[PDB]
Amino acid sequence: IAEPAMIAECKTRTEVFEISLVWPPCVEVQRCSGCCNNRNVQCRPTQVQLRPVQVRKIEIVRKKPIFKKATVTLEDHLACKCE
Amino acid sequence: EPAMIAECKTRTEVFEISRFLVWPPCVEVQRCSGCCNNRNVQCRPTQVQLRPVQVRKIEIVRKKPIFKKATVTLEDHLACKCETVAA
């Protein structure tokens, strides 16, 4: 029936990041997720990256439907390591 | 091409284990994440599956460590469909 547990080996995993209405709200971005043996050892990033994304910047202000377009830079995580 | 939405489906996540070191400190389980069109349309599970797993509950005793076996029970998310929710 029950199988043994397997460590969440530490690598790049997909995460859903909501932006701070927009469209697209949230967006998919990489991030180190995972565990290290010696509990004191910690799993963190060894190379990050920047990818700016264009965003529809809707502007529903004073009875003025006047949307815009912003740019929001994302932080990806290209390759992690426990340390 | 600018930013596009994160389809609402299921992507794996790591989930920490809460008790006495308990190896594995954390397993990957599958969870429902993503977005929708309205502010009150949420990416929610449509079927979950309840899977048990074995963990070694290491307790150090007197001058020696024991390797107690134990079954935590995880919850996998198998489906997902943007749902209607006053929210």
From Swiss-Prot, chain B:
Tissue: Expressed at high levels in the heart, brain (sustantia nigra), placenta and fetal kidney. Expressed at moderate levels in the brain (hippocampus), skeletal muscle, kidney and lung.
Bridged cysteine pairs (disulfide): C8-C43, C32-C80, C36-C82
Chain positions of site Involved in receptor binding: R19
Family to which the UniProt record says this protein belongs: Belongs to the PDGF/VEGF growth factor family.
Subunit structure, as described in the record: Antiparallel homodimer; disulfide-linked. Antiparallel heterodimer with PDGFA; disulfide-linked. The PDGFB homodimer interacts with PDGFRA and PDGFRB homodimers, and with heterodimers formed by PDGFRA and PDGFRB. The heterodimer composed of PDGFA and PDGFB interacts with PDGFRB homodimers, and with heterodimers formed by PDGFRA and PDGFRB. Interacts with XLKD1. Interacts with LRP1. Interacts with SORL1 (via the N-terminal ectodomain). Interacts with CD82; this interaction inhibits PDGFB-mediated signaling pathway.
Function, in words: Growth factor that plays an essential role in the regulation of embryonic development, cell proliferation, cell migration, survival and chemotaxis. Potent mitogen for cells of mesenchymal origin. Required for normal proliferation and recruitment of pericytes and vascular smooth muscle cells in the central nervous system, skin, lung, heart and placenta. Required for normal blood vessel development, and for normal development of kidney glomeruli. Plays an important role in wound healing. Signaling is modulated by the formation of heterodimers with PDGFA.
Recorded disease: Basal ganglia calcification, idiopathic, 5: A form of basal ganglia calcification, an autosomal dominant condition characterized by symmetric calcification in the basal ganglia and other brain regions. Affected individuals can either be asymptomatic or show a wide spectrum of neuropsychiatric symptoms, including parkinsonism, dystonia, tremor, ataxia, dementia, psychosis, seizures, and chronic headache. Serum levels of calcium, phosphate, alkaline phosphatase and parathyroid hormone are normal.
Protein's recorded name: Platelet-derived growth factor subunit B
Phylogenetic classification of the source organism: Eukaryota, Metazoa, Chordata, Craniata, Vertebrata
